[model samples]
Target chain A: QRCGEQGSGMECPNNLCCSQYGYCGMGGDYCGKGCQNGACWTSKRCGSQAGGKTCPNNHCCSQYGHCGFGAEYCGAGCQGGPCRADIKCGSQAGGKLCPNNLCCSQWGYCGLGSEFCGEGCQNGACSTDKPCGKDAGGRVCTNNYCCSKWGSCGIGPGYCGAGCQSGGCDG
Target chain B: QRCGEQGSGMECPNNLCCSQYGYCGMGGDYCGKGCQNGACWTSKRCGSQAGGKTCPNNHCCSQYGHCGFGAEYCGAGCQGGPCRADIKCGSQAGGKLCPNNLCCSQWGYCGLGSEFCGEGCQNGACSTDKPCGKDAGGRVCTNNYCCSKWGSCGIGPGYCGAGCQSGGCDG
Candidate 1:
């Protein structure tokens, strides 16, 4: 069958979480049922896109599966390792991360290691001008909100900066 | 009485909204309103103190009103010449605009034709980062899915330089 898991229902290929692309959807349905290549495959209800971009890969069959549309390569899902992070999206030095993943350099950067993992680096540091920070799912980056160069309030792909136009709690 | 049409709702001598440096709690009301010299007066908000080193003539009756609790100075409210244009937080040079009004600036930076005119320069050519553009009244930037340098879909921000990461989208 899909991954030869065959039947038995318990051992079904779709039953096992596919590391080939990390996890499938929020329902954890991995196999052709999720995504065949780099596109939405199954017709399952899956999970939220936030309701904007993030979906639980363990809950739904078509959940959290990557479909490189903004980058360069294709068929490069999470399991593929360092493949094109986005479809048509130009290339960078690093970033197998996701939406907020960065294209950091091999040198120094504002955020690294303990710093924000999602925020990308340009001039060898986590950028203030770039989307260099992971978002807490759908949480928006607020101005004057006091976002440290490193902190784990939320984990995802994106950036955090300043605060709202009216200013925020920070400083 | 006061200035007829103007005196109807006059609270300060210059007529400003949310009174510069006063005790404002719920309804954006301005309490502790007072004035000195031929100008207006109010307490300094936290924001004003952080803008510069000293807080001398910067208490609640500073030039740009009383410094608010932000890292910036906000003009104190008046009840005369200065009048608010709209409430929509138009443009961004610093929220709304007030005619013949004074805005907070970096000390010694306020000049003629520039004094009491909202913060930041609004009617400029257009900033690459800020939300508004040169016109200020133009369509607010959008699709900031990446970063300001990433450019708008109209121009498209160039891609990252080297390293490549795997990423995709599954229907």
Candidate 2:
């Protein structure tokens, strides 16, 4: 049976569940977070905090507010849980550039040092002139060199220490 | 206009945005997350994490995979963003009880010590005998006492030091 706001208050039968999408049945999609009525598996919530509560035990909270394991729960629209790390870069990444002076390698991945700025370095500081630091359009230094606080690129104690602005800086 | 896989290869007009839901338009709903083919705001992704990369600069990644600040992006399924602290407890909280050994007060809120366990403490270790600890159904201790590692409760140093499991304990 149809249910929830979409169902105009229609209720599910016994032993069944009302899903967030207004469908009636069982399984994570239905009895999980947005379960409107019937015998829901659990009450854990999700969605925009508006759905209420968070999952415990480090379990991933899906956009639907249901708590579970694996990519389905931790992947898209994951509100709270042990979600995976972030990746992606370059053009497909919209307007976002590589962070921390990292280079957007030709393959559209992010990385540091020579492996990144040496060859097909797209955005960020490329090798060669290695114009870097605040003085150089806020660009970071390429591999092998360090950035100085005042905005410039070079080697030795001056550029590699605390005064460094970007690139792989030293203590 | 329709767009994306659902749109049978239909595309948006110049400057228009394609929403993940397959609708075409302007504004955040369209250009934010699932802008399959159009002028998107940024590449920083969110949602199922399948949407793309993660948000940086400490920004919040929304369920739609868009990155930004505050509640709109940070609340619910806030994936990798600095989301607001989790709240809600007890029945109205679905099935989630209090976390961190906090009590679900009568108000259905989570909190520490007597303020929660004193009166209408719905769940968690209540005050008094509050039968708790590893040996006793793994119940935690209530206020006025500390939990011992072996599964017991008391108020002295033996229960308040490193061996303590729950309650306000010293280092």
Candidate 3:
């Protein structure tokens, strides 16, 4: 737990998202842009800045930029209105942390995407691509396919087992 | 920001509670026992454990052993019955983090008390000790004392200067 700064080798159990400032949870606040890991919401824009767009409702524009609720958004760089108050882990941040067990990139950054958690990952649970493994920056198992030792988000336990790197192995 | 593992120098922004597993958020699971920071339910005990107690009336018991009605207390950590989904922040877990802007203590544990936010604080926005500062570990300006540049939780710009560390100053 206590994720942030990317690739701290930590991951939030379940599918909770990690906030930009660090810490894990669910919903837009923790899942919005800059979300360290897990369920994140990056599609939306915020405030008078980006695209002159706005969050749907009850959502605040965050500091790192994104639409969501909670302090992560309305705290410091709030673009909506007012905010309450409060609180990144990054290797560059002196080895801070990443959210929701996201992979820290070798470049000292946190992210759920392949670049950060895939090859050269500094830290994190990790995965993906049509073919998963340390070498393949793949997806977490295409369709219902499971990753195996041979490297691939394929099906069957023959390719899976403890040797699987990323992708669905259980299914 | 991703707090937990007790004192990882990270705190959830605003009032979001850090979950027992590290991650900032609200609701029961996040504020229950072993919660890293934020509005944790330190009140009383519940479940078949402590005093072999039980939740009174309709109030539910969160997995953390707190008593209340909100989904936080009635959700994943629900003791009385029923449950939902979820999400601490501490340090020990290899330099993890704490929750909800709470201070990480030198011992590497998230808390609002003195030992955590005082002197050896590893991280988190702080206050406490009726006379807030790097010492007492008092509450964040109980009433409205704005924290000044100084270590005193007093009124006026004198102690509430930009150098303030904790307490009510503007008041």
Candidate 4:
């Protein structure tokens, strides 16, 4: 049967999806509508609905039981299945966790790098505040924080001059 | 004595050369003309007068002592230090060989996916010559060599139809 038509009973390839209209193609329009008895794949393959299945934080479980992201998982054949958006840092997703010290970036990325902890960080735990001091682990300073020779953090030339632990010396 | 200059008592970096003009830099101008008392690096960090070196046809030793190709390894800094221009298939330099009876492509890639084994496979072993008919393993064919469903190879409808083994039937 023709796709989007009536019970054409058409079968699509392992990588494609048979829409509710019985037409074979890729994307969401075909697989999400009135799909029934036809083939609907999400991840990489095509077949049954994968609504209840779970995927990685960075992935979306398509209706076809496939696990991945992009058009393949979010597009047709998705059939309103498990299409989790990119993981929010610090959230319990992808069977992993974002470090407690770092923040989850806006793009669902997690880390201490400027991209992950700086500007744009959202949807999860993000820290804009930077403390100045020396902890047992090491020197904890940023945003022009002065580092002294004795592993202390402060301001002015006295703490920034000679013997600074790390970072630039801003007098 | 200063590099390139008469006597100033100055040394150059390990990668740079002292020229007769008493300066530190690279190239024959700084290393060949009047080089003196300085470590000189050449041939992308390969063959050098500094000794202590160990180390490609399809591959090139970068100016930084690395093994690979592309502009970074073959272009600037590759001051003609054992840079073998030849790219022999099934050898080092390009990593590993092509598997699954595939051939090495002229571009140094490995695959049997039509384009890789077809024409322009001069630099490497081309698999376009896989003759027709059934072999001890399976239907051995290439390009559009039709493999019959009954484990045979031919061009007619019977052999090139659904029963074909290897390639597809053009006619």
* Winning model by TM-score: 2
TM-score of chain A of 2: 0.28
DockQ by candidate, in order: 0.01, 0.02, 0.02, 0.01
Give me the displacement of residue A148 in model 3, in angstroms. Answer: 11
Each candidate: RMSD to true structure?
A: 28.1, 21.8, 17.6, 23.6
Candidate 1 chain B superposition, TM-score = 0.17
Better of 1 and 2 by TM-score: 2
Model 1: per-residue lDDT, tens digit, B10-41? Answer: 12111111223321111112211432111122
Docking class of 3: incorrect
**lDDT of every predicted structure (CA atoms):** 0.22, 0.50, 0.44, 0.37
Sort by DockQ, best first: what order?
2, 3, 4, 1
- Candidate 1 or 2, higher lDDT? 2
Give the candidates in order of lDDT, highest first: 2, 3, 4, 1
* Candidate 2: residue B97 lDDT (0-100): 58
Per-residue lDDT tens digits for candidate 1, residues A1-171, read 111112101111111222133331111123234332211222223224334332111111222443211111112232211121221122342422222222232232211121221233232112233221344333323222223234312111111233311213232
Model 2 segments beyond 4 Å from truth? A1-171, B1-61, B65-69, B75-86, B98-105, B110-131, B134-171
* DockQ value of candidate 2: 0.02
In model 3, the runs with Cα more than 4 Å from the true position are A1-3, A6-162, A165-171, B1-3, B6-146, B150-162, B165-171
Q: List clash counts for every candidate, in order.
A: 82, 12, 72, 24
* Model 3 interface DockQ: 0.02
